[PDB]
Design a protein around this ligand. Structure first.
Ligand SMILES: [Mg+2]
Ligand SMILES: [Mg+2]
Ligand SMILES: [Mg+2]
Ligand SMILES: [Mg+2]
Ligand SMILES: [Mg+2]
Ligand SMILES: [Mg+2]
Ligand SMILES: [Mg+2]
Ligand SMILES: [Mg+2]
Ligand SMILES: [Mg+2]
Ligand SMILES: [Mg+2]
Ligand SMILES: [Mg+2]
Ligand SMILES: [Mg+2]
Ligand SMILES: [Mg+2]
Ligand SMILES: [Mg+2]
Ligand SMILES: [Mg+2]
Ligand SMILES: [Mg+2]
Ligand SMILES: [Mg+2]
Ligand SMILES: [Mg+2]
Ligand SMILES: [Mg+2]
Ligand SMILES: [Mg+2]
Ligand SMILES: [Mg+2]
Ligand SMILES: [Mg+2]
Ligand SMILES: [Mg+2]
Ligand SMILES: [Mg+2]
Ligand SMILES: [Mg+2]
Ligand SMILES: [Mg+2]
Ligand SMILES: [Mg+2]
Ligand SMILES: [Zn+2]
Lengths: 249, 96, 91, 52, 77
RNA sequence: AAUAGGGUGAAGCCAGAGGAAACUCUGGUGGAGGCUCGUAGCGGUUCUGACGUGCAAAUCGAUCGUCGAAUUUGGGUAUAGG
RNA sequence: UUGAUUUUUCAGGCCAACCAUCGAAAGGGAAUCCGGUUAAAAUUCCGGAACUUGGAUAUGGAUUCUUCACGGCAACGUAACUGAAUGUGGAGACGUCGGCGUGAGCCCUGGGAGGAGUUAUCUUUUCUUCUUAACAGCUUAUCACCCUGGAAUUGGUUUAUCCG
RNA sequence: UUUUUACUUAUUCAAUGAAGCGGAGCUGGAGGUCAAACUCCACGUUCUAGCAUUAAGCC
């Protein structure tokens, strides 16, 4: 047969992300002396739309502690953050929406976003619109914090990892139907080349494991082993179960 | 309660509504009290209370916004700040 | 006069996409085109830019909000939750 | 702009050709009021550094 | 080309060291609120600009013409 | 970079009428839409027309689809034979 | 980058995040127009009139004895009218559609000064020339802003209901 | 020999214009002090869309 559409994406010729209009990478500040020992104050200059992103971004200006210079940061805007607001980041920052605090400095039940998986990676968890991270508890002896991720998973993170207080702005986006193929076209025009999708069952046997037949049908189980190889992993990969989800999981 | 006292002053006493009138009344020493709405910008607020400090005038911080401050005064518009020139039948100055 | 009995703003879609999808669109699309009261200046001049971006024409304050409303219910809950937990820590 | 006299490119005020009149006015008032409160917060702090 | 309005400025300009030549142009005009009058344009060619003085008075033109430097080449048009 | 001229008439807004209220009705205004008739354009339904040693190794004619967007298109650029 | 040194030596003062290079005759971008001219070239030649950039450089004006100018309440004005390192901003620099407004060119048209056509009859008639470049000065605008004043009997106001 | 967990220098991951790490000591706030000051915490920035650069001062 032929190389299937799954495998052509790794080469990344026409499958790279369309990034001309993007407004910068959304990251926290580099963890420095001020954030480790006290707090540093910045001011929100802009709240802007980032193409390909549901969450708006905030442009926050900080002073450089060591040279006469202004540093502009690109944060993910939490809902309620406004232009001209003062943003405080550090160990001694107060528990206000938009402030960046270490996870150990936040009491249980604190809603936090753009949380660091590892100390200083500048934000990994809960970055999309309407999403957040809940702080479950602390383990001060081991310097660890328990959090709940938007997927429902419980994670143990260093208490020195940082997060931004509040919920990511732009939530409720999925509640409205797109209603049109053109709307999805414009949605993916600034994301990547993944739309529209032809069904593999509608192809020929060269194109896909599902192609061929005198009727459109998969022919074999569409649940594929985790240990299958590239060109085989088309369908439900390592599916623990199938069918309509009934009851609680 | 202060809303009732303030309403009486508007009915019987003397007052100015608006930032420009309030600052003029502080310059002339004709202000007995300055009332500032809750959503007034802090820079304008911190300047009105600097004028009152120089003018030796008490300041009352209204708990509602300029929409609620306007309707207490019987107005169909917004009042960000006001000054009481003459508390008349009311006793708002003795309570603040 | 009243021009449409029930479609309202979704009358631009004609007969397409299904009635259930159009009435689901109508609820959130009335909200995203509404004018909201500014919490800063007090005027009803707040309108949406892109999703999550709500600007006031008068005082030129931009606030981060929801996709189709200035504030979502989840954000309002977090505001009070953060406010409550802040009081205990600071006594 | 390189080939025109300076009066065309500026206004005789602080931040003349850079900021508008109202934004300069707000900077001046903000600078004065905030620095005045900095003194107040200092003398008050010294009031609590000798009795408490 | 720049126009000169002050007659005193024009004579001081015509004796600048870079002035090559001069042009005296006679235009037969009419003000439409009267009858024909003879307009005279004195044109001085400097390095960068040609300077023109319009003299609507037929007598002030003759006095001005003899007030120019004698060294200038004058073309009568 | 390009895309005549019409039809329909969505929100929003103005006025009038009715009602105790919750609200309803009428006349305008407005100018929405992967709306519509229809040029340029893009396409290529039917005649199973012409032609079928052609004007043409795919064209010609009439008829037709669509025609403000998932539109059409120049140039630059990327992807290379299991 | 300076003060230099004529001692053709130097003394230093700042910085070195990023930054090889290539990539557009439709993107960005310093500056030119008119008239004429050839068998065949012209925003290129000729005539005239400008402009930009780089460099050199004197005179006038301006400024200083209150050393680095004055005026205006203000928006701001002007012939000028110190300003290193470093920093902050602006311009470059930005989709699409709808109606409205203004301008320009074109179309239409009156008088007058010319030329041509029709004219058995009719036609104060039909056609045509009557133009003004870049550039310089003065003046000229929606929007925006300033001063005054203190508004419900709410007023102003767009084709489109927004503003206080 | 097998299981577990201690070390860091091999090896691996990440960041930064390699800027403040580790330990100790100055200063306060505390424990109730039963020798004698040991232990713990902190140790210049939070009404505001301003400013912070090329050290003043003392010896
Ligand atoms: Mg699908
Ligand atoms: Mg499909
Ligand atoms: Mg097939
Ligand atoms: Mg196969
Ligand atoms: Mg198979
Ligand atoms: Mg099959
Ligand atoms: Mg099927
Ligand atoms: Mg100027
Ligand atoms: Mg059309
Ligand atoms: Mg055909
Ligand atoms: Mg045939
Ligand atoms: Mg034949
Ligand atoms: Mg057709
Ligand atoms: Mg192409
Ligand atoms: Mg190049
Ligand atoms: Mg080019
Ligand atoms: Mg461009
Ligand atoms: Mg070009
Ligand atoms: Mg020419
Ligand atoms: Mg030619
Ligand atoms: Mg020439
Ligand atoms: Mg020059
Ligand atoms: Mg002067
Ligand atoms: Mg627009
Ligand atoms: Mg337009
Ligand atoms: Mg030109
Ligand atoms: Mg480092
Ligand atoms: Zn506002």
């Amino acid at each position: 047969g032929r190389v299937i559409r799954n495998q052509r994406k790794g080469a990344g010729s026409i499958f790279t992300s369309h990034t001309r209009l993007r407004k910068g990478a959304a990251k926290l500040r580099t963890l420095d002396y001020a954030e480790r020992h006290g707090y540093i104050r910045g001011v929100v200059k802009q709240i802007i739309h980032d193409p390909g992103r549901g969450a708006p971004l905030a442009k926050v200006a900080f002073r450089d502690p060591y040279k006469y210079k202004l540093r502009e940061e690109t944060f993910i805007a939490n809902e309620g953050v406004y232009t001209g607001q003062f943003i405080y980041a550090g160990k001694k920052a107060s528990l206000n929406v938009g402030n960046i605090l270490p996870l150990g400095a936040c009491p249980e039940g604190t809603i936090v976003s753009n949380v660091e998986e590892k100390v200083g990676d500048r934000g990994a968890l809960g970055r999309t619109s309407g999403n957040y991270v809940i702080i479950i508890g602390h383990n001060p002896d081991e310097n660890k914090t328990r959090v709940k991720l938007p997927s429902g998973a419980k994670k143990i993170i260093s208490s020195d990892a940082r997060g931004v207080i509040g919920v990511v702005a732009g939530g409720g986006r999925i509640d409205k139907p797109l209603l049109k193929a053109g709307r999805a076209f414009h949605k993916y025009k600034v994301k990547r080349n993944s739309w529209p999708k032809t069904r593999g069952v509608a192809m020929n046997p060269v194109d896909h494991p599902h192609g061929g037949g005198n009727h459109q049908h998969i022919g074999k189980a569409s649940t594929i082993s985790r240990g299958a190889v590239s060109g085989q992993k088309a369908g439900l990969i390592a599916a623990r179960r199938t069918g309509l989800l009934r009851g609680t999981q | 309660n202060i809303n009732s006292k303030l309403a009486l002053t508007i009915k019987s006493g003397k007052y100015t509504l608006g930032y420009k009138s309030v600052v003029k009344s502080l310059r002339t020493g004709k202000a007995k009290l300055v009332i500032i709405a809750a959503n007034t910008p802090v820079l304008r607020k911190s300047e009105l209370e600097y004028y009152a400090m120089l003018s030796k005038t008490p300041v009352y911080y209204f708990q509602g916004g300029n929409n609620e401050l306007g309707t207490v005064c019987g107005k169909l518009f917004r009042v960000g700040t006001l000054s009481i020139l003459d508390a008349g039948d009311s006793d708002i100055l003795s309570s603040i | 006069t009243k021009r449409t009995k029930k479609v309202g703003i979704t009358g631009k879609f004609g007969v397409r996409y299904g009635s259930s999808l159009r009435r689901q669109t109508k609820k959130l699309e009335v909200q995203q085109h509404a004018k909201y009261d500014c919490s800063f200046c007090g005027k009803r001049t707040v309108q949406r830019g892109a999703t999550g971006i709500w600007n006031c024409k008068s005082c030129k304050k931009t606030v981060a909000g929801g996709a189709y409303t200035v504030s979502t219910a989840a954000a309002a809950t977090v505001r009070s939750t953060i406010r409550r937990l802040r009081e205990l820590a600071e006594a | 702009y390189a080939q025109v006299s300076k009066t065309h490119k500026t206004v005789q005020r602080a931040y003349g050709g850079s900021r508008c009149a109202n934004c300069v006015k707000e900077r001046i008032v903000r600078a004065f009021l905030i620095e005045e409160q900095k003194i107040v917060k200092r003398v008050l702090k010294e009031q609590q550094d000798k009795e408490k | 080309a720049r126009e000169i309005k002050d007659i005193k400025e024009f004579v001081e300009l015509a004796r600048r060291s870079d002035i090559k030549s001069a042009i005296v142009k006679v235009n037969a005009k009419v003000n439409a609120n009267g009858k024909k009058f003879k307009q005279t344009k004195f044109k001085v060619r400097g390095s960068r600009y040609q300077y023109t003085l319009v003299v609507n008075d037929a007598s002030k033109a003759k006095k001005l013409q003899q007030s120019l430097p004698p060294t200038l080449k004058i073309t009568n048009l």
